[PDB]
Amino acid sequence: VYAWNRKRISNCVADYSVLYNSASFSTFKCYGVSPTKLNDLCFTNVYADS
Amino acid sequence: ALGKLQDVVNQNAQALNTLVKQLSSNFGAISSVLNDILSRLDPPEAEVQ
Amino acid sequence: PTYGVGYQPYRVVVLSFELLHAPATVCGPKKSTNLVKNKCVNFNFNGLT
Ligand SMILES: *[C@@H]1O[C@H](CO[C@@H]2O[C@@H](C)[C@@H](O)[C@@H](O)[C@@H]2O)[C@@H](O[C@@H]2O[C@H](CO)[C@@H](O[C@@H]3O[C@H](CO[C@H]4O[C@H](CO)[C@@H](O)[C@H](O)[C@@H]4O)[C@@H](O)[C@H](O[C@H]4O[C@H](CO)[C@@H](O)[C@H](O)[C@@H]4O[C@H]4O[C@H](CO)[C@@H](O)[C@H](O)[C@@H]4O)[C@@H]3O)[C@H](O)[C@H]2NC(C)=O)[C@H](O)[C@H]1NC(C)=O
């Protein structure tokens, strides 16, 4: 967590239906956006911090 | 000399400008554009904004 | 493995979506239709509905 990894996602298409239809998550909280709207939104960049 | 008339026009214009500019205020919402709120948020969360 | 739920490891991924004025480069699996001009349409340009 102190050296949390960051990856930059750009210039690609993502099917977020797979992500939020998954039952493998205990926490899935989206602020400022809805999980079911991501398939209709285009973003300049995404950062995945793990 | 015609300022009295022009003044009136100016005032009206000013008022409308302010009105239009108020559409760019968030008033606490995440966005001042209704289309962005509706396209990003579910109805339960969109109605709050 | 014997720890309680409050101390078991949890893997966390935080997705930060940035919507700037720059060209969009991460999109959903939504197919683009033909461009229709001179008509009243319901357009969606890079999520700008
Ligand atoms: C990398 O990804 C791999 C694949 O990911 C999948 O595909 C991607 C594209 C994406 O969609 C992902 O969301 C998706 O998961 C990972 O491999 C997968 O790993 C999964 C778990 O990490 C695993 O699912 C689990 O499988 C177990 C075992 O299933 C077998 O036995 C059952 C009988 O029990 C059979 O019916 C199955 O056919 C299998 O033969 C299963 O028990 C798990 O279900 C439990 O957990 C679910 C939530 O995860 C619950 O919804 C469900 O109700 C059930 O609940 C149990 O657990 C409770 C405790 O939590 C307990 O109290 C309760 O009583 C229940 O007993 C779960 O389904 C996938 O099978 C597996 N897929 C493959 C192909 O291997 C891989 O791990 C990933 N790698 C990394 C590093 O992350």
Side-chain angles (χ1 to χ4, degrees):
Chain A
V1 68
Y2 86 97
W4 50 276
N5 214 327
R6 160 159 289 191
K7 185 183 175 62
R8 192 181 69 90
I9 312 296
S10 64
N11 201 272
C12 60
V13 301
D15 185 2
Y16 299 95
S17 308
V18 181
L19 180 58
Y20 62 74
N21 289 335
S22 176
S24 168
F25 307 112
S26 68
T27 294
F28 200 150
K29 301 174 185 176
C30 298
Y31 316 99
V33 69
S34 176
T36 59
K37 303 278 187 172
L38 296 172
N39 264 23
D40 308 319
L41 297 171
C42 282
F43 306 105
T44 61
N45 188 93
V46 179
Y47 294 105
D49 303 327
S50 50
Chain B
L2 276 289
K4 258 184 177 182
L5 261 47
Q6 191 66 60
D7 190 69
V8 168
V9 181
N10 293 342
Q11 289 172 4
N12 292 327
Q14 187 66 78
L16 283 180
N17 291 344
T18 301
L19 196 59
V20 174
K21 291 163 188 174
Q22 284 296 88
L23 292 172
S24 60
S25 299
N26 311 28
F27 296 116
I30 56 172
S31 179
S32 67
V33 184
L34 281 173
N35 287 328
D36 298 6
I37 299 173
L38 293 175
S39 68
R40 288 194 295 166
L41 294 176
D42 290 324
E45 306 169 0
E47 289 182 5
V48 178
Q49 302 294 304
Chain C
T2 67
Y3 275 156
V5 183
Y7 286 85
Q8 287 177 353
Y10 271 81
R11 285 177 171 186
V12 182
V13 176
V14 174
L15 302 171
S16 313
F17 309 102
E18 292 193 349
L19 177 56
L20 310 178
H21 310 309
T25 55
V26 184
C27 287
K30 200 170 190 172
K31 301 295 148 199
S32 62
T33 65
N34 280 12
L35 182 63
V36 170
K37 305 170 188 181
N38 305 320
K39 289 186 175 181
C40 182
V41 296
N42 241 284
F43 59 80
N44 181 343
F45 285 86
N46 298 347
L48 172 64
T49 64

